[model samples]
Target: DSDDRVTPPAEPLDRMPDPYRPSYGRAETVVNNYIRKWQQVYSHRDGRKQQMTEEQREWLSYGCVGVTWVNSGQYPTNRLAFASFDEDRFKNELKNGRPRSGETRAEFEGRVAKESFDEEKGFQRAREVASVMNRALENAHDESAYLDNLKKELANGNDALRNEDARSPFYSALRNTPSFKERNGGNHDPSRMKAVIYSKHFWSGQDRSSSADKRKYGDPDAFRPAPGTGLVDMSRDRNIPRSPTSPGEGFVNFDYGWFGAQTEADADKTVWTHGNHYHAPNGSLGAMHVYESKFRNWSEGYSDFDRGAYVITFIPKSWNTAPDKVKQGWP
Candidate 1:
């Protein structure tokens, strides 16, 4: 009877069964979309026919080119103009201390930990998911590194742009070199462009949720501020959508869509169709291995984990079927 009262070992979440097997190649598929989009944007910027309109170009730049500004020290994401990179840098730098910001360390690490890591529980779930992600990252790095080397080899012979033309500001700035590529600019350099490595090592306590001035006044005990607690002159609350963990939470919503996908179906379609060749669950696709990866918050360990290498799909808006262009309201 007394043994029945014994506490069960704290494990991961009471969630769905992990469908993600190391062979499922889930992470590979998801990372592929980002890589492909970068390539598409890069090609367009290089004068490819599929040029995005100025507004569309700005959006793409926000996703791709603007990534360079992150962790660069000169630009900070806390500013509204830097919103795109805001969440990422917070997760990357503040969490991990990369290019660490000089902001005063929060006194209430425990308060923040409750919202972030759930220290009382030991964060078993977050760790479980992180293990899988660690595996996925190993495979991702190998693939990216190979691509970088190939790009370097070919970059030397890239007559696509003449030597004099390469002297133009565009090429020089991107490659950080006027005469030749200083780094593998054409390759997938995770350090400079973006990274898929699921590292819990680099999380910053200060994300959109954290503000230097607000946290001090609001909860002197808070790891950081909760929305507009301290600010007087700011027009908008630094944190708009409060944390899901926030007390008395209101509406919480998220919208996800694929910009480059013709349709959501098409996004998963091409990858699923190639399941036999490029996306084999196992290494049958050649050198790469598959593993589960989390979408956001790699640090909580395994709290919101998923299995398979990773997953993202594209579903395009359906057009009404009709012979005449006018039937679907088309020109």
Candidate 2:
């Protein structure tokens, strides 16, 4: 209310501001509690298939795998994932033959290399699976011969005395010869695996695993799965730590998955290697395949974390490296 012929009192700076003030112009009243939404969950949902145009699939198959046999674990070369100077056409053919295992070109070759390593080393290991297979074939020949003798014995009126059971010497002799199954056993175990290319969605920190205690590293993002009280915490979502990188190059948001290798030990042991897992964006990455009985291993890097050795067969090219023309996910 204005005083008659008198001026009203001026407002104090410390006074509470009205709702219509310029500072509060963006404010809105709360209505119902329902504000955010989430995707519906389902049981036994099918995973999204590797959906890509046929041209994309054809393009991805050009890359190949590399292999080495040694005391150290096998791993990708510094210059390339596998290496240069070898032809992997056989590996490519084998990969193309597999219908169930849908692998990118790089991935399938890696699998074949592992199987080839096992088979190639069988000779050195003295556990030659092929030798057993060959011996089994010889037994089949002997079995065929025995059948002829049994037929002759029946024709000679010795059929009354001819025993097809334990009393038959032909049957007894046939038992001593290794059957097809016995011959194949040596090659059956230590099976190869279907190669998979995996990566992480991490942005940055030291080379550490996602399972590490990020809070100790000072999670300005507060999404660090830890707690803190501050204004910075309020804007934590925007503060997510991601290494600055080019669009097609290094780290960015967590969309680009990271890469890791698993072994029989990994199936039974810890997943973390205590080192940072790096990954390229949706560009040229790595691939693998599983074939054969005995896999090869190699030591690659200084730490066991970096060291990875597998049976890898390098894909051949006209030059030292695969041309950028055939590169996948390129401009």
Candidate 3:
């Protein structure tokens, strides 16, 4: 009522702010509830889809999410609640991807304001998250034969199986793979993942995989998985801490979708060393993924791990050092 929430933090009279540091705005639960409510109000009763355009996602993702952190009564300009959102370190824009779960919309919409992200808090968050990312990159060793490892795992599970990539007439590159799945017949597990990659090793491993196929099958691309042939592509996604990068560069290939611990042990055992889970924003903010399996766990700062368990985070290929890019309603 007194415009206190909207007030920015006092000047840096005490400490400094990390440039690359980010302010995630609202807590995951709050954002989740807001999105749920927003969907109910804007959703079309018919089973088709929501009637609104880009604005819907904007309001749900950023509009509701930002107000919790930004100052109060500072409604979005032009009613474009999500317009001011800049590219967050995760590469996700102010507007996030499609809404996933829940239903319920409010009449007036939650009226809240945002405040300037406190430098001290921002730095601490960055520090904690950075630690997780660093640990992940450090522990995960490079195994050139990862593709072979998976092929072996699948083969042992099934009597017949396609060779890892090696290419088939059916598709492009068979580099996609799911992280967590259900347990079936002692093999089909609901959830699983690892922090493996073909880095300096990622690319070379791909080259090795191609050469191996060529050496054995006499054709490299021929061994690749084919579409509609009841075969899936080989090679799983790697823990990419940044996006807009390339195979020629550092750890590139970003794993999309949800990847996390399926069993109770995932979190209990790791103690947050690894990210509990992750979700691709379906945007460039490739680094922000990492949560608690089905539930969002942004409070932890990051997510991911190796065959055992890996941490997760988005330390941009160019993670700024000073934490300076403070977007209007964001950090």
Point out where model 3 deviates above 4 Å: 1-28, 32-143, 159-161, 167-259, 265-331
Model 1 lDDT vs. the true structure? 0.23
Better of 1 and 2 by lDDT: 1
- If ranked by TM-score, best first, what sequence of candidates would result? 1, 3, 2
Relative to the true structure, candidate 1 reaches a TM of: 0.20
Predicted candidate 3 versus true structure: per-residue lDDT over 1-331, tens digit per residue:
2211221212222232222222332222223332332233223223222322233323223321232112111221111000011113212311343222441111001100011112123223223322332333332232223334434444555522234235531111112221111121111221112221110101112333443422211221221222222231223323223221235543332222112212222221211111111212443332222111121222222111111111121211211111221121111
Name the top TM-score candidate: 1
Model 3 is weakest, by summed lDDT over 10 consecutive residues, at: 107-116
How high a TM-score does candidate 2 get? Answer: 0.15
Model 3: C-alpha RMSD to truth? 24.0
Candidate 2 backbone overlaps, count: 31
Lowest summed lDDT across 10 adjacent residues in model 2 is found at: 30-39
Q: Rate the local accuracy (lDDT) of all candidates.
A: 0.23, 0.22, 0.22
Winner on lDDT between 1 and 3 is 1
